[PDB]
Design a protein around this ligand. Structure first.
Ligand SMILES: [Cl-]
Ligand code: NA
Length: 391
C-alpha cells in the first residue's frame, strides 16, 4: 500500500547567535508545546558562516536561517532565489516601519530582522557627574569634552590599537555625519569615481576633524598602541578611561568585569545638534529556504518569534534593540539607552559595508590614522581600498 509520511514535521533552525542558544532553545520548546506536531532542530556549528556557504552551494539549505541581512551572501542568495519572498507576510508588519525594507533585494524582503546592533560611545556616568561633564551634542563639543577630561587629569578614551575593527563604526559615523547620512557617505566613498577622494574635499576635512578627536594629546591610555579589545573593555570597566567607542555588543563584556559605576552610552554627534547618528544591522535575523519541504512550519516558527511576548523572552536576556513592535524595552537608565534612542529610525544607519566588497582594510586605514596622523596617507588608503570596487 501507499505509505504517507510521518505525522510530525521536523525543521532546522540554523543559528548564528551561539551565545543566546539556550534562550533560543527554550523559546523553541515553547513553540513545540503550542505546536505538538512540529519539531525544530536548533543547529549551532563552529565557523557557521563558512558552513552555510558550503551547505547553500551544495543545495542543503536549512529551513530557517539566521543570516545577517547586510551580508553579500544574503543579497546574492536572495537574487538567486535561495530564500522565500517574505514581503507579503502579515507577520512582517510587526517589524518597525521601513526597517526590513533596508535590506530588500529587487524591492522584496527576504529577511526578518528581529534585533540589530548599534554603535556609539560608552561613558562613565559617575565620573562625568563628579567632573561636571556632559554628553557632547556636536563635533565641537566632543573635542572640548576630550580636552576637558585631559585637563582634569584623567584619560578620555580606551582605544584598542591592536584591534582596528573597534573603530569601524567610529569612522563610518564620521563620514555619515559629515555627508548627511549613510547613502551620502557611500556616495562620497564607494560610488564616486576612482581616485575621487581628495584631501582638499570638505567632506574629507570633516572626517579628519572627527578622527582627530581620537588624536588629542593625552586622549588615550598608556600603551594603547598594542592594546586589544579585552584590554579596553577592562580599562573602561575599571574606571581607568572615561569612554570607549564600540558596538552594543560590548556591554556584555563590560558587565562581566564588575564595574563600580553607572554605564551610559551616547551617539557620536553631528556638526549641528540633532544630527547625531548610529550604525548597525540585523543580528537575530531570519530567512526561510525557498525550497523547504515544510513551508507552513518554517513560516510558523518565524511568525512565533515576531509575537511581542515571545520576542520579549529573547530581548530580556540579550538586550540588543529590537525591531519587533510591542516589546517593552529597557528604560532610559539602561546602559545602551543613549546609543539606541533612535534605533530603527533614519538615524540608525545600516553598516556601510552592505555595499562594499570587504571591510578589513577600512578598519586598518582608520586605526593607522589614529596611530600616525598621516592625512594624505589616509586619503591614499581610502582610494586604494575603494578603487577596486569601482571597476
Ligand atoms: Cl594619546
Ligand atoms: Na507595524
Amino acid at each position: 500500500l501507499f505509505q504517507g509520511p510521518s505525522s510530525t514535521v521536523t525543521i532546522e533552525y540554523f543559528n548564528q547567535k551561539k551565545e543566546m542558544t539556550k534562550t533560543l532553545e527554550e523559546i523553541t520548546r515553547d513553540f513545540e508545546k503550542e505546536n505538538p506536531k512540529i519539531k525544530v532542530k536548533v543547529v549551532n556549528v563552529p565557523n557557521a558562516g563558512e558552513v552555510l556557504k558550503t551547505r547553500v552551494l551544495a543545495g542543503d539549505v536549512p529551513d530557517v536561517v539566521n543570516i545577517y541581512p547586510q551580508s553579500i551572501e544574503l543579497q546574492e542568495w536572495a537574487k538567486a532565489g535561495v530564500f522565500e519572498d517574505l514581503s507579503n507576510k502579515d507577520y512582517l508588519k510587526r517589524v518597525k516601519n521601513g526597517y526590513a525594507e533596508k535590506y530588500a533585494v529587487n524591492e522584496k524582503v527576504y529577511n526578518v530582522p528581529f534585533t540589530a546592533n548599534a554603535y556609539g560611545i560608552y561613558y562613565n556616568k559617575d565620573k562625568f557627574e563628579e567632573l561636571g561633564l556632559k554628553v557632547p551634542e556636536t563635533w565641537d563639543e566632543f573635542e572640548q569634552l576630550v580636552k576637558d577630561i585631559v585637563a582634569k587629569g584623567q584619560t578620555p578614551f580606551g582605544i584598542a590599537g591592536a584591534d582596528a575593527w573597534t573603530l569601524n563604526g567610529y569612522n563610518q559615523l564620521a563620514f555619515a555625519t559629515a555627508t548627511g547620512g549613510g547613502k551620502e557617505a557611500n556616495q562620497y566613498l564607494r560610488y564616486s569615481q576612482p581616485n575621487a577622494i581628495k584631501l582638499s574635499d570638505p567632506i574629507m576635512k570633516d572626517d579628519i576633524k572627527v578622527m582627530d578627536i581620537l588624536r588629542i594629546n593625552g586622549s588615550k591610555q598608556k600603551n594603547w598602541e598594542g592594546a586589544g579589545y579585552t584590554d579596553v573593555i577592562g580599562a573602561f570597566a575599571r574606571g581607568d578611561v572615561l569612554m570607549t567607542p564600540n558596538g552594543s555588543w560590548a556591554i556584555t563584556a563590560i558587565n562581566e568585569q564588575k564595574p563600580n559605576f553607572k554605564i551610559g552610552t551616547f551617539m557620536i554627534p553631528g556638526k549641528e545638534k540633532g544630527q547625531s547618528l548610529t550604525v548597525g544591522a540585523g543580528d537575530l535575523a531570519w530567512s526561510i529556504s525557498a525550497t523547504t519541504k515544510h513551508p507552513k512550519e518554517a513560516n510558523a516558527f518565524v511568525e512565533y518569534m515576531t509575537r511581542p511576548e515571545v520576542m520579549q523572552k529573547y530581548y530580556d536576556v540579550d538586550g540588543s534593540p529590537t525591531a519587533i513592535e510591542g516589546v517593552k524595552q529597557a528604560g532610559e537608565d539602561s546602559p545602551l539607552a543613549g546609543m539606541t534612542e533612535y534605533a530603527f529610525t533614519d538615524r540608525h544607519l545600516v553598516w556601510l559595508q552592505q555595499y562594499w566588497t570587504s571591510e578589513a582594510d577600512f578598519h586598518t586605514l582608520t586605526m593607522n590614522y589614529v596611530l600616525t596622523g598621516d592625512k594624505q596617507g589616509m586619503v591614499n588608503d581610502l582610494n586604494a581600498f575603494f578603487n577596486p570596487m569601482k571597476m
